[model samples]
Target: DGTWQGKQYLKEDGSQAANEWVFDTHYQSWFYIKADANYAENEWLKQGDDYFYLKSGGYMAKSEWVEDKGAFYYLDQDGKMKRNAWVGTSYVGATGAKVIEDWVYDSQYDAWFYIKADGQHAEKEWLQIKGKDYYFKSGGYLLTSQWINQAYVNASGAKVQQGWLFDKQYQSWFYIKENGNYADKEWIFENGHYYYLKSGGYMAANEWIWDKESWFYLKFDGKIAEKEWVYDSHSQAWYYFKSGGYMAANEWIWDKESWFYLKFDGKMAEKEWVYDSHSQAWYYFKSGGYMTANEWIWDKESWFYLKSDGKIAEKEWVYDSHSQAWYYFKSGGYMTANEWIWDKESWFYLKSDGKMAEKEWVYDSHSQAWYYFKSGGYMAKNETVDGYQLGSDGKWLG
Candidate 1:
């Protein structure tokens, strides 16, 4: 039977693994011995903190075997073994040992670790290699505890920060999330101003970014301008970026000489006409790219008159010298071209030429009589009004 080594037989703990156990086999036995601390078979014998194993040499070791030699790479001269990557080829350093080398890969870490010449992944340690200073954790890992180019990363390989970072699984940027990161194909507003970020977490540059059936402009810094005035001479107009970087819409804008209404798309509306629903008129945009208030616009065959709001004159009786009669431009702004209109009283028809049969003595085929319509383009029904007589049905009775 082997001599029993001095066995303390103390209690074990997960935290007890801290003070790297130093096994001394020359003064101990190959087995736990179960009796006491017994002297081993030889002066050099492999040993473990938990038990001992057969013989050793000048460079002997214990439980952790070195690759080529079958001898263990021990941490103590008394033969405490190491599990992961070690310094020497055959039992190099011992308990409280230190050494140096270029770099080492630990399968446990899945990363290249930097160990100092006098240390192996010790704390307060750093190394400069290939233009970068890499700091080593006390646990013998490369890096984990700092912010990177995109954002912050933790030891467990997670991207963390206030904004976004690269996610290789999607090949795009993702939000550092409360819920594994959310979709960023939308926009966010900050301090009432709108801005969008690129797929890679950079500010969107100048361009029209279309998202969700709308066109919004990203400024130079990718910020949406509001209540801001910008003059892009490259496009030759003052584009007011507003309402999330769209052209300020549905409002009259005055630019020194004239008032203009910019449509939803940053365009100086020219060579067209629009009817304002609130003002109830059809307005013209002339060659000057502005609203023509109180002006005559020569058009295809007829001279159109605009109201004070630059809308085409409509709804009231207007006199034309050519026909020497009064006509009504209906809500559609033309007394011509299939124009049938309703005014304060009844529905009436006009010629295809934008002229009215009212304000003159015209024959009424319906009643088979002459009807007197006053200059107001209305029939005097069943009464002598304005020196004319009309039946109750707009026919001359006298």
Candidate 2:
């Protein structure tokens, strides 16, 4: 794979000289021999006693003389020696065969060898040439009994084609076709089953397709009516009811009597009305004041009755103990009194000295009692009392 250049020969002084076979630095090693003219014809031409000459017809023709053997030998087309017999005994026998084509001479073993022939006659013979053992395959029916290296026989053996030999050195199963093409296949195993795959598409356990999306079902439903349905926590059953009606958890049908409607909190309400102990009938506490059934009233210090007559009463009408009726006092005042009475001592009256005295007492005809009061002084009785006070206090009491 590299290039080298040099002269082919050395100098007489045993040192490299000009034009005296001074090897060019470009012609350095066997890999660079293609660019060198000395080895350009055959880069693999080996020049030594061990190298046998291959003729132009692709056959070994001659061998170089070796000083250790002290002689040279030449092989004919039939792999027979032209001059000396170097192979064991050199006598040709009736049972002996001459193997010529593709023959090789191994100098290490000093023998002329050939690949084992393939046929029925050669199948029974097992030869141990050199240190290796080989057998001829009768099934091959190969044409020539050509002598070749053991490496050639190994490459063309049945074990190589059967994938028993020359594996990729890694423990992986390769998918090979009959025509020696490696397909895009891979070996896989699942659940103790081994298979080959061209593509990795397979449906796994519990896989499903619904609404154009993938889902996995953990449990299967066995009901005949809901065979396609799966278990759902929201439905609380194997099948989800689709009609706009109520359904019970264990009930098989959605009938009106069997199924109760669900409440707002997703619980089923009762079919009939149940008595609630927390709900009680409340009665309005009447404070001895007359009020209509639908009327709004307030009870504070007094029972403020907003009556149907549309008047707000505060005083002069007290509740009767026997009849429980709100009646006006016998003293003169409006039937629906608006004013609040403080005390009998502070009743409205005019004093005799009268600047409308609040400490003066007057006699009430209905109550038959002296009542102290203060008047507004604009009353005629109040003016009359002022005139009486001016006359009596200015004159004598008589």
Candidate 3:
């Protein structure tokens, strides 16, 4: 009583027509038949994203898989409207049930797949099928752990960076191996060199390594500190780490060396102006950032000189103003100042500016008559007299 297109003709009155295949079995399928249409070329059916192709009997003549809705579907070109399985690499499914994990796109293939979770045909990023990983290449086929005979492009037109096949995940390359497996995190040793996986991965950058009680180098994003002086604010010291992270040394020290001058953090001392913790004293670093017991500096200030050993001149000698005479600047870099200094040899009086007594003459008042103290600052104290003589009364003996 049903009237649809199958292998029989039906009457317009919903009754069966005579002399076609048995109406019972033929009733199962339908082909939309048009009034006055003959089974010639392909017929156009609408209500699909609606692609069209060459048709012969009841289906497509060239057997192409096309997307009708958003999903790609397969149908026979032979007009057979064949049962579902895959044809070539495209899936030809029942009337239009569609093969699907939901038509997915692979830029790697530049194609699409109606993959299923049941693992009919898929690549993992993936699912495990019956305890084994099965892969399907984009041209549409199943794969194994076994090597593929021919190399084929999947979809991506990019680089492959694995083992023998091209693998491109780690930003580094690897050759996809003969076994059909790609390198992910495996270590590779070839031709006397060591290399890591072809990334088949990213994100792993650099590290510091220790080996056999020695330190080794693994380059970083460029913070090389080898042999260059740098400061550590933590200890407020300066130092350089050698190739092996060892601190450079062997030359400086003394706070408590009288020689060594290393700070708490190992930053060595240098000869330069530096600030003090209290900011009170303007301390200068010595040219002696380090030195070997000698120094070179002269005082432009009259009679002012500090010795290499850090002492002001004591028991030292310098010339009097005239250079024709020798004079002494003692322990304090001092010259006699308005007082008499007995040299245990001669009695000389000091003048104010820390200069030793020098040439010319001056008077001593104790005797009330002019007894000369030479301008060079000598007294007639029980000793020699210059240009004249003095009596025990300290007066000029006429």
Candidate 4:
């Protein structure tokens, strides 16, 4: 094959024709000559680029992609090579080849890659596109529907921010703030509920948190407790926290129409008697941790009277309106029944039912004598009571 008058001929017997494609044996390449018998070398053809069909080994690949010298190029239906533009929906470079720039879908890898305008694939970095944030991995593969470090990437490969993310692995919720950092050692309010995040950024749930000076409680669903009485099954006691999440301890709190006392350990006093040094009184708590007031409460083996002020009445006389009788309490708040009590200047007798005797004659089998009680619940001495003579020892002389 040789070139003659700007035309290429691969044959000898006048077989070379005008406006035809020919392959040269010497160069082992393909080319096209024009109608004017001029070589179509480096010429922009109507159907394709100048080097579209001038491949080294074969004719131009039509309506498909072709690779030469490690570069790929696209050809249209009429062998027209596309350059510096898009072919169908894929981008092609200046060499009329598919490129790696821009948002591209790689079918071979079955993944998406973002090649920014800087001519580099995004790898191991964050990209904010279209008002959304996306994170890419080391291999330029977008990370989606998973957690990246301390942040969460949604299904669309967007980094979620300023919200809460529920982690299935830890079974807890994490608060992501505006700075893209998980909230820790703080409180968050959402949907009319307050949540407390621990030091490790996990929501505190169904537990107690003592933060230095104050104590807080989180419910089973990870909601902070406030201004309510909560009964904890773990400690088997009741507790109350203020509206600001301060637990009541070592104090008396009137709640739900009853008075309750919280111990120093933040546990409610139940079924026990507590003495308050502040008021110099003893309070008895019943089964539900409620104070007993204006009533007679029986302890393990003693009877104690609780006044209207929720204080134990010790060493005093209490008149029971229900029984229409008067009873005397000893030093330990124990009622005296079937016993004789000697006051400063009077001797009073109490029946078996703890009722005081007034204006009556009672016989004492222990002493084998009879005693007379006057109107003031005192024994009469050396006086005539109801036409009966009483001895000086307050004994009746019948």
Candidate 5:
């Protein structure tokens, strides 16, 4: 009899098959028969805990993986599904046929693993791919972005050292010193530049930093701005940092034979007038940030004389050694020029050159007269002074 949904025994008597394997020669297939005398078709035959898949047409699936629905099932040569075991280089789950590649976390071993393209996991090895290096543990777990065995692995699992590292976890950048440790709350020198790492290990850059009772500026590249003038666009001002990178504030800086004054805000005073309480004088910073010294400055409807030391000669007569002339300044530092000044019950004349008249006869073009001043720089009047006759009006007469 020919085989159908149920199988017939291979005998001349033509008996029905039951609870055994039957071969249908016409269909050329093998099927397992149940005690109900029906051939297995497209179902799993379970013997104890092992399962065997009977594919379409009642044929047993063996020696390969079978696609059941969306999942895979592996059958061995004996037509039994392999569960929780390695079939060649691939691994099967409890239900059989589990394929994985790249990195995976295996709960069975409670560790990570990297599956090779050959379906084998890496264990206790170093893999170099592209331009990076990675190390796998003895149990086949790849280290990632951490310190292992005194070495560092980046987020992409590459071992790196002796450079800078931006750590996203800490949200900061850290400099890996030559000794392989990050700089912490200290100073570091690299590439001829000095950088300060704060307590959180982030480089101080593009701002002002205060430490050790001094203020310092860090550039955009994390280098300390030292021994130079740094321009801050935020405040729209210029600041001077000394040799050790400390800001010079409210003080005078003498560099390269030029004098500069820094205000309380650490900005260089430029093209303005400033007074120093300590020096008890006024100083004018020119356009180039140099103090006006040993010269006459005309400003704001008056002329001023700055002494050799850059202090305004106020309410006094000063002898300029540079020009070998004498000048008199009022209380507000305005030089007396082309005028007669009455001071301390004496009259002194200052010519148009802002020089005090001493032991000289000066012709006043404004008044159309002549004036005689003694050696002591006082105008003589109402008497015969300096061998010249003077009228009662302090003017020279016959």
Candidate 6:
């Protein structure tokens, strides 16, 4: 036999507005039906949004208004009725005619059976076959006037298949075990232990069996600090010392044809020599000092010397080819070229023009013409006849 159950909700006017129907068969599978009063009109039902359809055996049963107890219909995918069962008009009611029930056909007893009452049953010996409950009398007699709860039948003899529970928060699926907590999806017992599917992998309260290979490493703060090896099985080549200065193989060295040297201070010499070619050696000049290749020399004497021509001798002796000269200093208040007998208060210059002046003298430079001085002041040539006047005020007048 079969059984049907339903719940009803009332509208504001105390009329039935919505209903949910459930049909349980002897084979243990069930179907659900729902109908609401808002879908009663043709325009409201044609909108296709207010109807519910149940698919069974490659067909559908669509209903906008709940049908009577024996109503039958078939629907397509678009929720339009394709076939309607023949029913007498005497059983139809304009309103509130929809009833929930179930029918079963028994081949052995050769009868059609239904239950009309809510919770009334006759006493008989019960038997569970394939997760459904049945009432039977002695001598192969089956009772048709009884209603049995399918929940009681399922609790006693049903074999619930294991299902996969997907957790949206963790984004993983878990398998329910036979002898484990079934209602709570987090509790799963497999291989005699409880397990949980975490975000990282599968785990238990005390242990785990990871489905992926787990890696362990040392991290400085949040960065991994170990080297990873990538194997190249085809080429038989190894890439060593990755990003850092770590070596995974033997030390490598390069060979070249040129001579190589290692300098600890990072300096190298291309060739060996005793002295630099661009540097010169110092040579001593005849004037008692050291000289290089291009420099001048001075005489080893004072500013004046007595000459044999009865005039002062002021000459620049140069080392045009490196020779020595004799030099001496005389006791005079001024420098002169004439041989002077000193009376010690003042000295005078004996000029080549035969004039004895207290300041006029001549000087010689190595690379220029002869020059003359008046009273220790520089004088121009051929501009004076008498002793050209010289002053400390930086003016020359003759």
Best by TM-score: 4
TM-score of each: 0.40, 0.16, 0.31, 0.75, 0.54, 0.14
For residues 1-398, could you state the per-residue lDDT of candidate 2 as single tens digits?
A: 22222423333444323311122344331211222323232212333323333333222333222111323344434333343223332221121233322233445444443434331123334455454334444432222322232122343222111121122443233333333333233333334433332331221222222222222232221111121333446734233222311222322233332322222322233322112233321112233211223233433332333233323333444443343333332232223233223344322332222123233434445445433333331112222343342121122121
Candidate 3 lDDT, 1-398, residue by residue in tens: 54545534465676545422222345242344344332223544432333333345443333555554564555454333434455553444445545555444545455545466443545433333343333456544443323333232243322222333333442433444344345444444445433334243211123333334432222232233354455555555565455444444533334424543344334576654333343332222455354223222333444443345444444655453333444555554543344455675556655555455556454534324554455544555444555576766445666
lDDT of 6 by residue, 134-219 (tens): 55444323454322331111222232235344446654444433432232324344454334534433323322222333222212
Per-residue accuracy of model 5 over 1-398 as CA lDDT, tens digit each: 44453343443446766788766678666678777777777888888898888887678888988877766778988888987666655677666756565555557665556667666777788776555567888766777779665456776677775678776776766787655556777888788888889876688888788888889899887899988888888888889998889999999998768899999989999989998888777999888788899887888988888887888888899887777778888888988888888886888888888888998788889788888887878777888865777888987776
Regions of model 6 farther than 4 Å from truth: 1-160, 183-398
Clash numbers, per candidate: 17, 12, 39, 2, 0, 5
The TM-score that candidate 4 achieves is 0.75
Looking at model 4, which ten-residue stretch has the lowest summed lDDT?
49-58
The collision pairs in model 6 are 311-337, 311-338, 312-337, 312-338, 313-337
lDDT of 1 at 316: 68
Q: Candidate 2 versus the native: TM-score?
A: 0.16
Q: What is the lDDT, from 0 to 100, of the residue 324 in candidate 3?
A: 46
Task: For model 5, state the Cα shift of residue 219 in Å.
Answer: 2.3
Question: In candidate 6, where is summed lDDT lowest over 10 consecutive residues?
Answer: 84-93
The segments of candidate 1 whose C-alpha lies over 4 angstroms from its true place after superposition are 1-140, 143-160, 163-183, 189-193, 198-203, 211-213, 228-240, 246-258, 263-266, 277-279, 301-307, 314-398
What are the per-residue Cα lDDT tens digits for candidate 1 across 50-91?
Answer: 223334322234544333333333433434544443644321
| Candidate 2: residue 391 Cα off by (Å) | 86
TM-score of 6: 0.14
lDDT of each: 0.53, 0.30, 0.43, 0.77, 0.78, 0.31
TM-score of 3: 0.31
Ranking by lDDT: 5, 4, 1, 3, 6, 2
Best by lDDT: 5
